[PDB]
A paper describes a structure:
Gastric infection by H. pylori depends on the expression of a nickel-dependent urease in the cytoplasm of the bacteria. The ure gene cluster is comprises seven genes, two of which code for a nickel-dependent urease (ureA and ureB) that hydrolyzes urea into NH3 and CO2, one for a pH-gated urea channel (ureI) that delivers host gastric urea to urease in the bacterial cytoplasm, and four for cytoplasmic accessory proteins involved in nickel processing. Ureases (EC 3.5.1.5) are amidohydrolases found in bacteria, algae, plants and fungi with an active site composed of a carbamylated lysine (KCX)14 coordinating a bi-nickel center. The overall single-particle cryo-EM structures of H. pylori urease reveal a 1.1 MDa dodecameric complex of 12 UreA and 12 UreB subunits in a tetrahedral arrangement, in agreement with the previously published crystal structures.
The map at 2.5 Å resolution depicts urease with BME bound in the active site (U-BME) whereas the map at 2.0 Å details the binding of an inhibitor 2-{[1-(3,5-dimethylphenyl)-1H-imidazol-2-yl]sulfanyl}-N-hydroxyacetamide (U-SHA). We determined urease IC50 values under identical conditions for BME and SHA as 13.5 mM and 19.6 μM, respectively. The density for SHA shows that its hydroxamic acid moiety interacts with both active site Ni+2 while its rings interact with the UreB flap region. SHA coordinates with the bi-nickel center through its hydroxamic acid hydroxyl O18 with distances of 1.98 and 3.10 Å. In addition, SHA O18 accepts a 3.06 Å hydrogen bond from His221 Nε2. Further away from the hydroxamic acid moiety, van der Waals interactions occur between the imidazole and phenyl rings of the inhibitor and flap region residues, especially conserved residues Cys321 and His322 whose side chains are within 3.5 Å of SHA. The difference in flap region positioning appears to be due to the bulky SHA imidazole and phenyl rings that would sterically clash with the side chains of Cys321 and His322 at the tip of the flap in the BME complex, with both residues fully conserved for the 260 GenBank deposited H. pylori urease sequences. This steric hindrance results in a displacement of the flap residues away from the active site, with residues UreB B321-324 having RMSD values close to 2.0 Å. Interestingly, despite the binding of a bulky inhibitor the conformation of the active site residues and the coordination between the active site residues and the bi-Ni center is not disturbed when compared to U-BME and to the previously published U-NAT and U-AHA crystal structures.
Numbering used by the authors:
A (entry chain H): 476 to 569
B (entry chain H): 191 to 285
C (entry chain N): 1 to 569
D (entry chain R): 96 to 380
E (entry chain M), F (entry chain A): 1 to 238
Write the structure that this text describes.
Amino acid sequence: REMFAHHGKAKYDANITFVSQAAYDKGIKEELGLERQVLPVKNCRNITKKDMQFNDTTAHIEVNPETYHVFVDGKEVTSKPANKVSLAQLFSIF
Amino acid sequence: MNLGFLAKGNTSNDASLADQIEAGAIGFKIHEDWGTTPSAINHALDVADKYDVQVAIHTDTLNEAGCVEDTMAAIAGRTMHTFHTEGAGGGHAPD
Amino acid sequence: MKKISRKEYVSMYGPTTGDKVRLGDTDLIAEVEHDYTIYGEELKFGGGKTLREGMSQSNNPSKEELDLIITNALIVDYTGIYKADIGIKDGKIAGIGKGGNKDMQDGVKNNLSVGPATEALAGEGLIVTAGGIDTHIHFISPQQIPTAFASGVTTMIGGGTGPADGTNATTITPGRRNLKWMLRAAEEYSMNLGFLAKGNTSNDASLADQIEAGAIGFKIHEDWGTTPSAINHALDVADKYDVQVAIHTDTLNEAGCVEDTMAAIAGRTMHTFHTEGAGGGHAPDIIKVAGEHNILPASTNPTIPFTVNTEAEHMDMLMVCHHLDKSIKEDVQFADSRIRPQTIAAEDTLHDMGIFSITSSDSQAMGRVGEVITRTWQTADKNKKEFGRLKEEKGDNDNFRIKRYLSKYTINPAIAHGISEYVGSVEVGKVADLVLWSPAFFGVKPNMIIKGGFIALSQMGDANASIPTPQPVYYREMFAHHGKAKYDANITFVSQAAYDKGIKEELGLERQVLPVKNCRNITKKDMQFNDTTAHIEVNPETYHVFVDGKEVTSKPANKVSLAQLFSIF
Amino acid sequence: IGKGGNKDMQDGVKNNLSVGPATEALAGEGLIVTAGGIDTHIHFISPQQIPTAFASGVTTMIGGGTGPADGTNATTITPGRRNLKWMLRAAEEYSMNLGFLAKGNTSNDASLADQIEAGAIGFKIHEDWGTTPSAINHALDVADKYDVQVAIHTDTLNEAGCVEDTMAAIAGRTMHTFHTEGAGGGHAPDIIKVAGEHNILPASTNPTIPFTVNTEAEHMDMLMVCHHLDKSIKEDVQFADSRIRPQTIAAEDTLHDMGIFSITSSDSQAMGRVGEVITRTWQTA
Amino acid sequence: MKLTPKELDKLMLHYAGELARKRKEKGIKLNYVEAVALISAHIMEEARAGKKTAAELMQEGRTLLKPDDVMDGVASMIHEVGIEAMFPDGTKLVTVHTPIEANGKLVPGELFLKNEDITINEGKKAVSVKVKNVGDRPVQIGSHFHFFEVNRCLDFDREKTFGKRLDIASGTAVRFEPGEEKSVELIDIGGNRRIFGFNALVDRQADNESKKIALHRAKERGFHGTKSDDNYVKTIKE
Amino acid sequence: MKLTPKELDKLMLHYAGELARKRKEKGIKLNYVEAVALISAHIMEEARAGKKTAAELMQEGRTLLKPDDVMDGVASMIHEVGIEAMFPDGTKLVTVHTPIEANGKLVPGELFLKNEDITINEGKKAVSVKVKNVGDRPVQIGSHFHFFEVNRCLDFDREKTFGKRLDIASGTAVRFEPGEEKSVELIDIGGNRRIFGFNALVDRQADNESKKIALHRAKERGFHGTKSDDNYVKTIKE
Ligand SMILES: Cc1cc(C)cc(-n2ccnc2SCC(=O)NO)c1
Ligand SMILES: Cc1cc(C)cc(-n2ccnc2SCC(=O)NO)c1
Ligand code: NI
Ligand code: NI
Ligand code: NI
Ligand code: NI
Ligand code: NI
């Protein structure tokens, strides 16, 4: 159920609308009459795969054009399908 | 909910690309149903370099204008976020 | 991978983890505890070096790009002794760590990004500390301020109105109009400043109006009358306005003894000036309050270190100022109860035990404004020569003693006067008031002063020369000292109540104006590395000093370090 | 500029030279009047340079820096909007016309343009921040759009190319060259050949003029101190002998007398003397 | 007189040196300030006299103070003394190197180092490349320069050096005389491996796709030792 | 050198003293400024030499100038000369008391006084009270302190001292050693007789009604010699 931060004018103070830096500098919040917090995004262009935390592996990947097998640095990579998963039927009625 | 919106990246008109960013978008999506060609990829990345926003892509499944290496040549080493990279949701068949 | 010998590594980049350095001409040895660098990716500036475009200066920098970076610095602070690069942005310390260009180097975070807007300063082989804070200034002459600045002090707290007789005795700026005079005069100087008001009254409305006029606290001084009534009223008002109180107690025991003063204080927080008692206080036993929980005790510099010329000099100073005569038996009896070489000898050992926690000047009023840091390190060196290496040390170094004595003039006075969120240490988010030292000259003569993120003072040769090094070299004002730039680089501290009523706009001040806070909820346990409490007794006849039953004393010295090797006068 | 006086009593007095009750008088009989000097190679290392230059007859100083930091000790550069704000607000102290140069050593066009909008009158490109052909090209492109000047200290080590590669990067556009003889820095050994070109405005700094019998030894010992060289290493000796070159130093005075060099300057407290530009010019003449 | 500020500063320096000389005549061991002042004042007077060159004064400044004339620790603190003085041919800079030998054990600011070596660029494997300078002018290359884009008169197999830099101590350099040939050690550039500038041969992310473009650009601009095949296929953005 | 402003000021003082010494060698009688400078410079040089204590220099400063060496009037103008100097144990203050004896009759700023005494506190009749210090620490009392509210270790008949102060010269004091007993003279406080502060025993108008409250308060806080009767009756405001 919804609590008190979901309601009234309190929800304006508790939520953020993200925009570009250029729209933020031209005053988009005042022009459109927005009451939420408005903040700019930044540092989008100088990041690579090495900036991802704990998942930063680079490799050479090849796909066979006929059998569709996948190779990572020469080694074949696959897995087996599962007939049962956790966190599913124990917890939900539907 | 905190929210942010993506604009249309499938065009070769630089002025149309720039006006969407000034109107409040945080980035572009390039999708094959609006036409993912190397020209549109190149123009969208050029504008996003100037405005410091991110680009996301759904690539050409039908290989209509080129294959995966042609898309990578259009990207030309610049930063890109790829959606559903396995390819069941869309992308260059089969690789 | 390559192997580089330790000697040439240190000659290129300064000492690293495990290496040791002697501080000045003393016997104190500091050891590097940790290093943030990645070996092979060091920052160097010059022709053919690494700080060039596309290599360590980024062509695609972060949006938090630095204004200035200090490379390969050895930081000496109460938080530790370690090697790092220091980044400055918008007058604040923005980052402490590795620094460089993420496009070409591995471990560079966003707050240490080097770009086209960045200036470089080479710190290899040098020591960086925080600026000193002096809390016992008599504002007798404006020429004290450049003297303190050249010794490495960047904040001065005290009171006065110039060379009047009230200021010559007491650190007091009395009343709203005199506070307005001093606050408007303060716009001249390259120093953070704060002013104390008159606490010697029993009128609550007069006490409160001075705090609203801009003062950061009260001084209670015996020449304006230190009675238990005035102590009680001043502490009551200071509880309501969140400001500090300092006291010079009743030497003559006119209204009561030391326990009556402590009863008037009634467990509330108090800063005590010159607690040994040579500068004033209950004869002969004011030094016993330094064991108490609610007292923040301080000593002034002319009694430290204890030397063979100390007693005669102080006796002749006492005879001049009080106009005493040796032919009168009451002037002789007064003088012999004042000076007391027993407590003076005990003071050095009490500093070494962490029972005294703050050092200060008492400037031009029995004390020397350019010698606080030097006399602190002289006392540390004398105590190491007499009592040996401390038992709290880990390893073959003196790092614990170095932190204990460094805290006495940097972080502890900042905590005591409620400005430790702004100044006092080298930490991320604080004001960039920093001092650069060569290790051969540590503690006596610095290289340069950075004030508010820009260089304000440095050693400098003659202006017509082809390089800044040739003779004569002396301390000269830099660009942060001049024009309208000095308004952006300096801070005037006021009370929270004066800040909220708009004192900056009312008096037309152009400096930064910031409020003090958290002055009333601190005790002796909040002092870094000097937090010892004990039971202290003074014999009423022989004036011997006992700490938990054990007698405490020291020997006078005939020679000190950091004195005649370094100065022509 | 003319006769001056009172038309009621004297013949040839025009309206713009009328002397009246609001006029003050200054006697110039037997004296010489010149314009104030203009020094364009200032390292802003210490504020005490300014009264020294003022007493020698210089009334405008153009350069860059932030005080005694290591970047300013080498280069005439005030980098970035915030540091430009610091220096412009400090400039209100002094009795001197002033102008500041920004950092030109980058390939980011937006970073170059923001410094010009923050108040700089031009760029300096210096080899200690990296003088590559890419940075030269980008800086000249931005300076064409904003109508400001570019100054250069070229690559002494020939790391990315020789002098003709630098001239190819310049590509016929206007450039001011500092210490073009090359004792203060530049392509070893032939940076002096650019002083014959049409698009180059060439300048010399004062410690090499006039050429005296103490010049070579003094400059050699200055080079050994600043680079921390050792005479026992064959590569430091080979580097030093390719740097100083008394042949080009001797040629510099004659090139000044022929009108091939056109500007003199100081290089103040960075191998040069801020109170001696005018004096060394007349000594050379 | 029309004194300048320089003249006033030098007058003060002269009388500081005179005080140091009087104290030396009374038998007092000089401190740091006194020794520096004495050497500076002596050099200025000798240059005013006009009978000696600057190079002779550089050697004469080393004989003024014996090791027994100064306090313990002074000689280790004074590495050099510089002073400008006016000769008959004008103002010159005179630097006196190591004027006093030491005789005691006190070294202020002394360093106590461990004896273990430092390993730089750990985990980076190096390769070896032979390089020849076929030009007529010397070339010197720093530690973090992109070695693929060095001066076109250096001849080497440029394909093997893409994305690499010299494996030397940071801030040092390697020198090539005209006609000189030697081998160097190269390691991979770290970080994001985004290469911008240097000769504008890459200006993008370094990878195998960008290597072909860089080799074609280097061959068209005449960089020695670059081998890119004929019938090159252009991309949409080069 | 890294000179401080203190070093520059002391260098100027040294050469002022040197000029005074040269003028004394030429046979010129020294004036006020010259004599002060000569004594200060001599003390600074002796402290630099390091063979004498500060107390010895305080006596050595009194032998430098004979009475015939100075102009008439100099010796009466110089009461003391102070100078700070750096010893081997650091900076110390040396004060030289009455360095020159006088030999002439000229006294600048001379006072010519009448010989009649001054009567202070006219019209105030004094009473005499015996006071004993039964504590272990010395006590000193000023001229305008409310004598009823002095240190509780002093024992005297406190009822007779309400509203009174010492009948001595304004700004002087009376001292009590431990165990000492003596008599003092007391007179009534003037003005509006509103007593605020001092130990907060009155804090109101002084009269016979406020004396009872003050005596009760003094007895409860243990002031010696206070006699207030049992079965005290409180008022509405105490
Ligand atoms: C020991 C001493 C030294 C000096 C310079 C003055 C005094 N002196 C004179 C009158 N009252 C005092 S004590 C106040 C003080 O020196 N700081 O608060 C005592
Ligand atoms: C010949 C010389 C003299 C001096 C004082 C410095 C250098 N020196 C050191 C490192 N880099 C340089 S050259 C930069 C310059 O002096 N002006 O731009 C060379
Ligand atoms: Ni999709
Ligand atoms: Ni005091
Ligand atoms: Ni004081
Ligand atoms: Ni240059
Ligand atoms: Ni220069």
